[PDB]
Amino acid sequence: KPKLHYSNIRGRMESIRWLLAAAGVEFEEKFIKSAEDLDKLRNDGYLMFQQVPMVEIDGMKLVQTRAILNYIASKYNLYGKDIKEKALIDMYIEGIADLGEMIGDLSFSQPEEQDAKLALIQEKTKNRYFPAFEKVLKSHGQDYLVGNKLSRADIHLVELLYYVEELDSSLISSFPLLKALKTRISNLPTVKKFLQPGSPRKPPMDEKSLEESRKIFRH
Amino acid sequence: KPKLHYSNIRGRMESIRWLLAAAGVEFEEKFIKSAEDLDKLRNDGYLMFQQVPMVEIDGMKLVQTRAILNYIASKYNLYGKDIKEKALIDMYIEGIADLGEMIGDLSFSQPEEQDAKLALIQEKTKNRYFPAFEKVLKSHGQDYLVGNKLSRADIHLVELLYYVEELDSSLISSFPLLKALKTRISNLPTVKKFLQPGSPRKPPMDEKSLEESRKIF
Numbered sequence: 292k293p294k295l296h297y298s299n300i301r302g303r304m305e306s307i308r309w310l311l312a313a314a315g316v317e318f319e320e321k322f323i324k325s326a327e328d329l330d331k332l333r334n335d336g337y338l339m340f341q342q343v344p345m346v347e348i349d350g351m352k353l354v355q356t357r358a359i360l361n362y363i364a365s366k367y368n369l370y371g372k373d374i375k376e377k378a379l380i381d382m383y384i385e386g387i388a389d390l391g392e393m394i395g396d397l398s399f400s401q402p403e404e405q406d407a408k409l410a411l412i413q414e415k416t417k418n419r420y421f422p423a424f425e426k427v428l429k430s431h432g433q434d435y436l437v438g439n440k441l442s443r444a445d446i447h448l449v450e451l452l453y454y455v456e457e458l459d460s461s462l463i464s465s466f467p468l469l470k471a472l473k474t475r476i477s478n479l480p481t482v483k484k485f486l487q488p489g490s491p492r493k494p495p496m497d498e499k500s501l502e503e504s505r506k507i508f509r510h
Numbered sequence: 511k512p513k514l515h516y517s518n519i520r521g522r523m524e525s526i527r528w529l530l531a532a533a534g535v536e537f538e539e540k541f542i543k544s545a546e547d548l549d550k551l552r553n554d555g556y557l558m559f560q561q562v563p564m565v566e567i568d569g570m571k572l573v574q575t576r577a578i579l580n581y582i583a584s585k586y587n588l589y590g591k592d593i594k595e596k597a598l599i600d601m602y603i604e605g606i607a608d609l610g611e612m613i614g615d616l617s618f619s620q621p622e623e624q625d626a627k628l629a630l631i632q633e634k635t636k637n638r639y640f641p642a643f644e645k646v647l648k649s650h651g652q653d654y655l656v657g658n659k660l661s662r663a664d665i666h667l668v669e670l671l672y673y674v675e676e677l678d679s680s681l682i683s684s685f686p687l688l689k690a691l692k693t694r695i696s697n698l699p700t701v702k703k704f705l706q707p708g709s710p711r712k713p714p715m716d717e718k719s720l721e722e723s724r725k726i727f
């Protein structure tokens with residue numbers, strides 16, 4: 292079992308939880324609970340950069356979200372089949388990560404700044420990100436983003452579709468190919484099990500977890 | 511000659527400018543001088559997500575800084591031999607990237623925030639990132655970060671080592687291994703010409719260029 296080091300939150304670890312489940316890979320989680328547990332990881336020398344997420348896979352203590360995601364995607368052929376298909380997967384997913392940063396930020400902002408920032412997410416979703424991904428899908432009518440075969444870009448885009456619906460159900464309403472991508476992926480046996488109740492998938496940020504985060508990562 | 515679309519600043523284009531010259535590749539730069547030079551790009555449908563950098567390469571109009579670098583690095587075999595070397599290169603370069611964001615964030619701030627934002631970079635440089643990259647060289651004593659060969663990881667770190675030096679010259683002083691990597695990578699024939707005067711290598715952010723920035727985007 293590769294091992295997942297992080298607090299018990301979506302956070303930066305969540306996109307790795309998604310990818311491994313979609314690859315059929317059982318993993319293990321070791322939840323940081325205090326700044327002390329975290330300090331322990333640093334002092335043991337497990338964290339190259341004194342930060343989490345960290346994943347122990349195949350001999351390595353991997354840090355940096357992208358590095359972990361890259362490795363797992365190549366290991367299970369979810370990173371395309373040539374240098375050109377990587378180009379498209381990387382374009383799409385860096386696009387996906389960008390809308391992600393805004394979404395995480397909002398869940399960590401104060402009540403005061405929350406309206407302005409969601410209005411900015413709503414705006415960029417409908418006008419910038421969703422049309423672009425809808426366009427890709429139409430250009431070829433194929434069931435996946437790249438090479439007509441399951442990749443990470445599909446896993447990551449559908450992860451993001453679930454956050455948008457938590458923020459505003461009608462942002463996907465004029466985008467029918469994303470509507471049906473959302474559907475099909477969700478139904479691939481590995482993503483179905485991951486989506487079902489009691490899986491390792493994490494709920495939205497709420498005040499008590501925000502507290503915990505504040506005190507664990509002493510920021 | 512693939513074609514770089516960005517303004518006449520470092521920004522997110524610079525790590526791409528550095529990697530290409532280090533690899534030998536001559537490239538074009540078509541500069542964005544105005545809010546409508548960019549508006550144009552969007553309108554022609556050049557920018558997947560309405561943004562730049564964008565690099566016309568091998569038939570693709572590539573956006574996203576990480577997608578562009580990833581491609582260039584693979585094409586020119588600076589991305590490791592196998593999947594496993596890749597993960598070491600990836601962990602490494604993303605670490606360089608986080609202190610990268612700190613240094614760019616500083617350059618776009620007004621002085622009212624700078625003093626402080628610098629104090630943070632210094633603290634993180636000496637106690638976090640520099641020690642991390644020393645420990646990797648010390649452990650293998652080899653001339654490059656990964657696989658006993660030049661990879662993009664050596665390239666990014668040396669670039670970053672160079673901005674640190676503009677900002678506080680003595681941060682690197684207790685790190686004779688990086689101190690040493692800096693010299694070697696810089697005397698590499700390709701990296702030597704890019705470091706020469708007159709190259710496509712970009713000058714530090716200043717007000718003039720900041721005025722342009724606020725104004726184009």
Ligand SMILES: N[C@H](CCC(=O)N[C@@H](CS)C(=O)NCC(=O)O)C(=O)O
Binds near residue numbers: 302343344608
């Ligand atoms: N480049 C990021 C950095 C990760 C990061 O900043 N991790 C946070 C938790 S969300 C952390 O460990 N904070 C503790 C610290 O920086 O000292 C990544 O994708 O892993």
Ligand SMILES: N[C@H](CCC(=O)N[C@@H](CS)C(=O)NCC(=O)O)C(=O)O
Binds near residue numbers: 561563574575
């Ligand atoms: N994902 C980044 C995003 C690029 C980005 O935000 N670029 C700015 C210039 S530094 C831009 O084009 N801003 C216009 C906008 O987002 O509307 C990348 O690596 O390309």
